[PDB]
Amino acid sequence: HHWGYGKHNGPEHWHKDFPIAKGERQSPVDIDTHTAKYDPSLKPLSVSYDQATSLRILNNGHAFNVEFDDSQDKAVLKGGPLDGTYRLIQFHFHWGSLDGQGSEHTVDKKKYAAELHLVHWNTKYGDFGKAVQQPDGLAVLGIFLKVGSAKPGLQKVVDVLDSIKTKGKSADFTNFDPRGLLPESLDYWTYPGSLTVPPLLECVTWIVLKEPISVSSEQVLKFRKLNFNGEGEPEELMVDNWRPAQPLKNRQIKASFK
Ligand SMILES: NS(=O)(=O)c1c(F)c(F)c(SCCO)c(F)c1NC1CCCCCCC1
Ligand code: NA
Ligand SMILES: [Zn+2]
């Protein structure tokens, strides 16, 4: 009876195994755009993905992860609210059964169809497993997806999904350039928070871009053909793998713009 997204094991259940679910800096949150304050001390984000080395794509039974070589400083995030250098380790998405839901963060209560998370770890901590134990261990770049025009840079991901339909399947996924998933503007909101799945560790600096990317209806429909189950088990479509907004508590969301 492990955690997941269903009625019986979904977000409202997680606190029983992971009491940090009711903690002081949980994610995601609603971003109230009128309360978020512009912070002129924030810096432009530096997203340096030119040397990114993708390796593999894995259906882990919750989402799919596109994994990178993080054994040297290749693809890094710095600047913005961050001190120091964070190395890209993986990205993944959260999405809905319908276009009107699927994002984890919300903007003035608006849900997007999906949300991309590029996960990076603080190189001061030496590895990804040590970084998750630290209050400033991770930096996650969050990008909303809306349904409209296709995102050409997403198509290589969509096209491999049929090879990793079920939990525990993986496929080689080299030479994928994550710069093709970025919007035009790097304006962002930032706040301190957590992983959005168990173990729900409070180790994340969240950086959520204001400008969504557009993906096509066909692209997101392909995400919704994946399965949470393993091969040879009853089919459970991988949809609605998002945690709802959590209490902001004693936190301020800062804006890099306006
Ligand atoms: N939003 S997120 O970054 O918290 C996240 C998901 F929501 C996911 F659904 C997943 S799928 C694997 C769950 O074990 C994920 F890897 C991450 N990223 C992981 C990075 C930390 C190291 C592994 C522990 C799980 C979170
Ligand atoms: Na290496
Ligand atoms: Zn995520």
Swiss-Prot record:
Changing residue 62 to A: Reduced CO(2) hydrase activity, rescued by 4-methylimidazole (4-MI). Reduced proton transfer. Enhanced proton transfer. Enhanced proton transfer capacity. Changing residue 115 to Q: Strongly reduced activity and sulfonamide affinity. It is linked to Osteopetrosis, autosomal recessive 3: A rare genetic disease characterized by abnormally dense bone, due to defective resorption of immature bone. Osteopetrosis occurs in two forms: a severe autosomal recessive form occurring in utero, infancy, or childhood, and a benign autosomal dominant form occurring in adolescence or adulthood. Recessive osteopetrosis commonly manifests in early infancy with macrocephaly, feeding difficulties, evolving blindness and deafness, bone marrow failure, severe anemia, and hepatosplenomegaly. Changing residue 16 to E: In Jogjakarta. Catalyzes the reversible hydration of carbon dioxide. Can also hydrate cyanamide to urea. Stimulates the chloride-bicarbonate exchange activity of SLC26A6. Essential for bone resorption and osteoclast differentiation. Involved in the regulation of fluid secretion into the anterior chamber of the eye. Contributes to intracellular pH regulation in the duodenal upper villous epithelium during proton-coupled peptide absorption. Activated by X-ray, histamine, L-adrenaline, L- and D-phenylalanine, L- and D-histidine, L-His-OMe and beta-Ala-His (carnosine). Changing residue 65 to L: Reduced activity. GO terms for biological process: angiotensin-activated signaling pathway; carbon dioxide transport; morphogenesis of an epithelium; neuron cellular homeostasis; positive regulation of cellular pH reduction; positive regulation of dipeptide transmembrane transport; positive regulation of synaptic transmission, GABAergic; regulation of chloride transport. Changing residue 60 to T: Reduced activity. Substrate binds at residues 196-197. Belongs to the alpha-carbonic anhydrase family. Its EC number is 4.2.1.1, 4.2.1.69. This is Carbonic anhydrase 2. It is found in: Cytoplasm; Cell membrane. Changing residue 117 to D/N/Q: Reduced activity. Changing residue 60 to D: Strongly reduced activity. Interacts with SLC4A4. Interaction with SLC4A7 regulates SLC4A7 transporter activity. Interacts with SLC26A6 isoform 4 (via C-terminus cytoplasmic domain). Changing residue 65 to H: Enhanced proton transfer. Zn(2+) binds at residues 92, 94, 117. Gene3D superfamilies: Alpha carbonic anhydrase (3.10.200.10). The lineage of its organism: Eukaryota, Metazoa, Chordata, Craniata, Vertebrata. Target of drugs used in treatments against glaucoma disorder and breast cancer. GO terms for cellular component: apical part of cell; cytoplasm; cytosol; extracellular exosome; myelin sheath; plasma membrane.
